[PDB]
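[STRUCTURE TOKENS]
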Amino acid sequence: MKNVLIIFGKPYCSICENVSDAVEELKSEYDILHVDILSFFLKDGDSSMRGTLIGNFAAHLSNYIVSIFKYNPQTKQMAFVDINKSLDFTKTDKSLVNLEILKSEIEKATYGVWP
């Protein structure tokens, strides 16, 4: 039975979309599921203190949240994929993701039961 990759990110943005796209090329190996992150809130306390230009900035970084998990439905174990090395956010196209590094990172991710 195929293991499941679970991809978290904002819907309708280039970064998570390019990552999902790359991950689609591995569909013969994994089932894929998307959790959309729909809602962000900058903590009330942090909103009390450069210029708040940094506030908008932190809002804008929501576009660059992407996390991948690897779930094994038969063992019921979970794995955290370490995807950073396959990513280069200074890029705007496919080159954002390097599939061969992403494949490796997904494949080496170790399983555990987390309480």
In short: The CA atoms of residues 65 and 76 lie 26 Å apart. The chain is about 25% helix and 25% strand. The chain has one domain: 2-110. The beta strands are 3-9, 30-36, 66-72, 77-80, 111-112.
